[PDB]
Amino acid sequence: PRKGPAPKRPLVNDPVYGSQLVTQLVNKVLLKGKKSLAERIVYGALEQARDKTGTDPVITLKRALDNVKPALEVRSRRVGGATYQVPVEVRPDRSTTLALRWLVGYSRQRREKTMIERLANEILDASNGLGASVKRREDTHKMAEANRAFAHYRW
């Protein structure tokens, strides 16, 4: 706001999988306070993910995120009589946030039956670099690589 930064909230380690990345994924799936429902999707989709690779799924999850982290985003600004996008650097804890919104966000409009198998396909199609969440990485970058001329207006 006006008065500087606000203290960000801590995340406890997930009890089944010893990593903070899984408990940050269950909060993007979470709707309407149904957290035990959102934990039966993320625990369910990771167990479905190890039955098609055999690799441990939190190692599969981090390679799914390293292919959808943006390095440059395209924040907008009005200058004169024409407004145009400005490429800025993405800080690391936003790159985790903006990627997990894209796995959950493009899995809700994917063509399968249950959310457990829609999410488990998008993680596996991003660990290989083929999904639709991966395509938004090289659409955010292409809009940020077509606007290097405007990098001198950094607010």
Binding site: R148, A149, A151, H152
Partner: protein, 117 residues
């Protein structure tokens, strides 16, 4: 097929555009690739990014004719005046001397009327 080892790079940088031509010391033009040759159109040509690609395109096209060392003669009140010189160093050239040949009239001809924007 022209071959010359020592050259002279001229840079003109206005409020609308930049042009980087590269000549021999006798004054004959070798390569001239500017900010419209590198793909831009409109107000984007005046940006400092469009000057560090115009200077790269004239540098590699001059090194094919054997240019290894240039002299820099900038002129014009532009913002792509410093980024074009640093762009020539990261293309395999040596800058040597940097001069300033901006034309300064001795109160000669009359300037146009001032803009009431």
């Amino acid at each position: 097929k022209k071959n010359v080892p020592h050259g002279a790079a001229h840079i003109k940088s206005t409020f609308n555009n930049t042009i980087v031509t590269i000549t021999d010391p006798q004054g004959n033009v070798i390569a001239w690739a500017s900010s419209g040759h590198v793909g831009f159109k409109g107000s984007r040509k005046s940006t400092p990014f469009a000057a560090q690609l115009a200077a790269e395109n004239a540098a590699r096209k001059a090194q094919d004719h054997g240019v290894r060392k240039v002299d820099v003669f900038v002129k014009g009140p532009g913002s792509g005046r410093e980024t074009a010189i640093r762009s020539l160093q990261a293309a395999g050239l040596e800058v040597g001397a940097i001069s300033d040949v901006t034309p300064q009239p001795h109160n000669g001809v009359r300037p146009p009327k001032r803009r009431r924007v």
